[model samples]
Target chain A: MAIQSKYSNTQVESLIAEILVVLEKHKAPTDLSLMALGNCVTHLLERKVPSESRQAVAEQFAKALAQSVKSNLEHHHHHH
Target chain B: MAIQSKYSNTQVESLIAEILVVLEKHKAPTDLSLMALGNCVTHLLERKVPSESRQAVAEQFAKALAQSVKSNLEHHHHHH
Candidate 1:
């Protein structure tokens, strides 16, 4: 499929339907998007860490935030 | 001088009043907090840098943010 083509609702739905069928046929567990996982990581860091340690954690947190945004763009924003 | 002492309105007021008197007496430029400077850095990076570089910027941003909060607490949170 040409990724650059403008989206058609029907075509997109058809692809989703096809993907679902494949998943069901294969009896596979669905994979989650990395973006979702990234938020979890951020939240975990926030609760587990103290303010004094934030300087160091911020470095990692920022990376996680970027990764989350990237995953969002790749998984959802690239439509059409 | 005891840090754990519960805040007294007059004592705190006296300290501020004294500090202001000193500042006025000395004719200070009124030094700005690092926290304020850190925000500027964050904003500059946001506008000048590309999103692709955000991962790196975010790390520093988080550190700056932590520093800002720390400054805020030390300067304002602790009271005798």
Candidate 2:
């Protein structure tokens, strides 16, 4: 009863894969990497959603991102 | 020389773990899960950073999130 997102699981991973493919092309500092990825998030959000629903969409994104990773953290001892 | 962010990698994983622990306490629709996690991200970023840096922080967050999972995705074929 913890999480159930049937659709976005693969969608999120694919999206990340899309981003990560391009991610391999660059070599840079920390903040730039951060900014670059953030920029990716923003543009991805803006392209598919309107400003009114942007935050809500981003929220779903955060959920999928967490849900995507939760599979790993929930197993085993749960500390790192 | 592709990507390098020394400090935030562990920090991002820890933050996701913090959010996921509480995630197990609730079970509901998908959007609620999305809203709930979005709330967590907003609160965490706002408390630690300023308004202007909020977007920047979120952006960095996406980087680490992507980076955190990149390890597993890279190891396998990644077409699941």
Candidate 3:
């Protein structure tokens, strides 16, 4: 299985880490936050970082994690 | 701007955290993982969780994090 990076962006990663604090604080399900996460990423990228920069960042990240993630998923499925 | 939550889903967030381990392991640049993360979230949501459940989960998280996240972004940008 392909292994993907821990985060998509430094900001999102940091955001994730911090968010974990809040999640742990509230005991919110980690999976329950996906929509919020997507929105958060979009919100941060749209507001703080440049559009082109955000797009480039997304593309580069995809290339980096795709194969690894695909393999990882395969491995997960096999295990399950 | 709304104050969004730290994560959208409990699972994606967890995946994000574990992915962080891998990223830290590789020292890969983040902000680079949006596309890949989008895919990872998508893959997991699709494969692991049921589609209906995933969509409902996304909606609920959007409601949970939207207002809060919007506010946070505004604050961060103002600080910058």
Q: How many backbone clashes does candidate 2 have?
A: 0
Give the TM-score (vs. native) of candidate 1. Answer: 0.23
Q: Write the per-residue lDDT of candidate 3 for residues B1-80, one digit (tens) a residue.
A: 68465653465556445545544554434444344345445544555566567656544544443444445446566667
lDDT of 3 at B72: 41
Which regions of candidate 1 fall more than 4 Å away from where they truly are?
A1-80, B1-48, B74-80
Docking class of 3: incorrect
Residue-by-residue lDDT tens digits, candidate 2, B1-80: 56565635564444333333333333323444444334334434444555566556656576554454443335466655
lDDT of 2 by residue, A1-80 (tens): 89886556665444334333333444334444444444334433444545556655655576655454454435777566
DockQ score of each predicted structure, in the order shown: 0.04, 0.04, 0.09
In model 2, pairs of residues that clash are none
Displacement of the residue B36 alpha carbon in candidate 1, Å = 19
- Candidate 1 chain B least-lDDT 10 residues: B30-39
Residues A1-80, candidate 1: write the lDDT tens digits: 75553334454444334333432443322122111122223333344556566556655445545554456347456666
DockQ of 3: 0.09
| Cα lDDT of model 1 by residue, B1-80, tens digit | 65774445564444334333432443323122112222223333344456567555556445554455456446665566
